[PDB]
């Protein structure tokens, strides 16, 4: 129905330039305008301005008049935020949303967001480490096994305990940055009947470094 899928997350060293694309479907592009919003982590949601997909004319908000530039590939129904000279406080997530009415007071149907990690840091690819237990019956007739995905940059990382299949009783924890890199981990609990019996495998993909790992949590005990 309306779906606005956006570009994937972007890493860019300070002072650089980025064009974040947003492709519309469901509606007639020209009769609804694009609203762009900044959800910066420790602060909240900010309107950036709005563009008229019929005339092409952008409005900008005060805090955005200057490096932000709205542009549109009408012909493919795409709005793009271009940010120039990436001052570090542009580390945030940018949502494009369809402005219902004229000027975009009502944003109904939002896009999934794109995350700009403005950073001097280098891409480091991860260390996927199978954590089999020192046995320890983790609750009656259950065992919890783990997967430490250390030392990578930038975020994200896709983690699936066996190709999407161990779905219930998984806890992937948020990643945390230790100055230059992140450390992420997941747990999964299974009944004793299932492990070491079947093959639980950590299927970790670092898409920035073209890295896909499958560490089998082998019984080691």
């Amino acid at each position: 129905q309306i779906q606005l899928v956006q570009s994937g997350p972007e890493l860019k060293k300070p002072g650089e330039t980025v064009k974040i694309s947003c492709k519309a479907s469901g509606y007639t592009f020209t009769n609804y305008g694009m609203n762009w919003v900044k959800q910066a982590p420790g602060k909240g949601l900010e309107w950036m301005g709005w563009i008229n997909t019929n005339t092409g004319e952008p409005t900008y908000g005060e805090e955005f008049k200057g490096r932000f530039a709205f542009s549109l590939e009408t012909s493919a129904s795409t709005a793009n935020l271009q940010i120039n000279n990436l001052k570090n406080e542009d580390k945030a997530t940018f949502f494009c949303a369809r402005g219902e009415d004229n000027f975009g007071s009502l944003s109904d149907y939002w896009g999934q967001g794109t995350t700009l990690t403005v950073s001097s840091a280098k891409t480091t690819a991860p260390s996927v480490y199978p954590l089999a237990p020192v046995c320890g019956d983790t609750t009656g007739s259950s065992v919890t096994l783990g997967c430490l995905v250390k030392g990578y940059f930038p975020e994200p990382v896709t983690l699936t305990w066996n190709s999407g299949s161990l779905s219930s009783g998984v806890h992937t924890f948020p990643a945390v940055l230790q100055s230059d890199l992140y450390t992420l981990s997941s747990s999964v609990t299974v009944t004793s009947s299932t492990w070491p019996s079947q093959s639980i495998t950590c299927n970790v993909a670092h898409p920035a470094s073209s890295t896909k790992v499958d560490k089998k949590i082998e019984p080691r005990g």
Partner: protein, 214 residues
């Protein structure tokens, strides 16, 4: 610019109960208040506009109200999945200003953490590093302290913690606590411990290990 102000910023209701989230503009904004909802790590969804008009297909259990500079969103029969941040926006005159967002915690009864400690992967020890992971899974309330103790001595540092945000399904929290030593410091010791104090028990919930077969 019209300033929208929300207080408090965190709220806790039980399941099936009610919450009222106050929002407040700094001048009469004539019911031109929109409420969005941002489910943990998703887009906002426009819930209501003009103070009480529900958008297409939000269930009638979300009711808004207001006048002047004082508006409020009420949620009744709070589903475990209403855990999200609620945001008021103003929709009267430019620019469209938002409120800080109020986080809605769901108030489950207590649980106690399924604590579990992990030795280094042999693999990591081969890399010359030694992380000792302790998971503490599915506890309620949110307030858990974990200390690492190597050889009965406290170890405050080298630790990284991360909490899962509250679980939408079974309203609980969960946390990794990671200790990262040098292969030598690791290979110089023997009793590693992860102790957790939580509302669920007076006596420390403690998991310790040194390698043995099972």
């Amino acid at each position: 610019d019209i300033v929208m102000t929300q207080s408090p910023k965190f709220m806790s209701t039980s399941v099936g109960d009610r919450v009222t989230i106050t929002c407040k503009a700094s001048q009469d904004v004539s019911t031109a208040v929109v409420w969005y909802q941002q489910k943990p790590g998703q887009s906002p969804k426009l819930l209501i506009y003009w103070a009480s008009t529900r958008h297409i297909g939000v269930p009638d259990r979300f009711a808004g109200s207001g006048s002047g500079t004082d508006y409020t969103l009420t949620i009744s029969s709070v589903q475990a999945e209403d855990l999200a941040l609620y945001y008021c926006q103003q929709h009267y005159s430019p620019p469209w200003t938002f409120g800080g967002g109020t986080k809605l915690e769901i108030k489950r009864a207590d649980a106690a953490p399924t604590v579990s400690i992990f030795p280094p992967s042999s693999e990591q020890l081969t890399s010359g590093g030694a992380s000792v992971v302790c998971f503490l899974n599915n506890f309620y309330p949110k307030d858990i302290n974990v200390k690492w103790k190597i050889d009965g001595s406290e170890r405050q540092n080298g630790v990284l913690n991360s909490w899962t945000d509250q679980d939408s399904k079974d309203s609980t929290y969960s946390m990794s606590s990671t200790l990262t030593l040098t292969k030598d410091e690791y290979e110089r010791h023997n009793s590693y411990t992860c102790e957790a104090t939580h509302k669920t028990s007076t006596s420390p919930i403690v998991k310790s290990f040194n390698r043995n077969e099972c």
